[PDB]
Every structure is written in C-alpha cells, then in structure tokens.
Design a protein around this nucleic acid. Structure first.
Length: 139
RNA sequence: AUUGAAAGUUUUUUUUUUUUUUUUUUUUUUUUUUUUUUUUUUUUUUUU
C-alpha cells in the first residue's frame, strides 16, 4: 500500500502511573504512528477464484472495514482502524469456476463506489458464499 | 689366404578431410514485527 496523504506523529507512553503503589515514574517509552486521515492505495488480485471464494474475501474485507478486525501493532490500545472510501472491483474472465459455485446475479465487471455502497453492491457474493455448501476438506 | 671377390634393400609419399556436448529446466511454497505500560505525583493567584 502506497501512502498518498500520509502524516506522521509521535506519542509517548512513558507514563508508568501509580503502578498500584507509590512509584509514579519507573520506565519510559514512546512510539511513532501514522496519524489519522492518511490514504493508502490498496490492490489485490486473484486467479481462478470461484464465486464463493470471492464472497468470502469480501466478507473478510467487510469485517476489516467495520472494525471487528484491526491491523497494526497496538491493537489492544485501539491503534489500527482503517476504512475504504473508494474501491474498484474489476472482474475479467468466467463468472463461475467450479461446480460448487453459486450462480450469482450478474453485477457486471466494474464495481466501485464509496465503501458502504461498495459493500452493499457485493451483497450477492457474500450471500452466495454464506449459502454455499463447502465440500472440502472431505475428512 | 674359404672355388671367391664386391656391392646399404635403398631410395620417394604429412594418417589427412567432414562434426559447436547441443535442446529443454523461473531457488519457489507457506509465516500480520506483536505483547503487557494512565505523560503521572508535589505547588492556596497571591502581601507593607
């Protein structure tokens, strides 16, 4: 991902607090993060992906977008939360790959827009993936 | 002092020419630099 409008900002958590005792300063630490509002170009590509696999990838992306999943170092402190404002989806090739694929409504090839309407557009893919009997592994 | 002898088996001729150890063969397949840490305590906006 290539930053576009990136802005760097530091923060220090040198604070050791009361430490449930008497000492209020024992150690020191500071971190450098990327400030909010930065923009990164995100691109990923897939080969011979069936409809259910694409829907599952879209489900992963939606979980990331909603905030249920976070990316970064200090996730417990609420450091990594990213959202999509403009994402294009281009499909080239066949519509279904395997016999296990669900025939999805033809949404075309170029799917784009704001993040919310984007995920609203990929509803058929996620619905097909959820309503897909996954054969493998046989076990 | 042999019946009794005096003659190099020698000259001359390049084992040479033709022929690429060559074609095909992606040092790649997988792994989130995360993880625990409160920028906290002390100080009367105040006198001849």
């Amino acid at each position: 991902s290539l930053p576009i409008s990136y802005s760097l900002n530091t923060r220090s958590m040198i604070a050791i607090s009361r430490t449930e005792g008497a000492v209020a300063r024992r150690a020191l630490v500071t971190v450098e993060y990327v400030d909010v509002g930065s923009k990164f170009s995100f691109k990923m590509m897939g080969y011979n992906l069936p409809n259910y696999a694409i829907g599952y990838l879209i489900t992963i992306m939606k979980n990331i977008h909603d905030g249920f999943t976070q990316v970064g170092g200090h996730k417990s402190r609420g450091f990594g939360f990213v959202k999509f404002g403009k994402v294009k989806f281009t499909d080239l090739g066949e519509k279904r790959i395997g016999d296990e694929d669900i025939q999805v409504k033809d949404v075309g090839d170029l799917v784009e827009g704001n993040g919310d309407e984007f995920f609203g557009r990929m509803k058929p893919f996620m619905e097909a993936f959820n309503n897909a009997k996954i054969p493998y592994p046989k076990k």
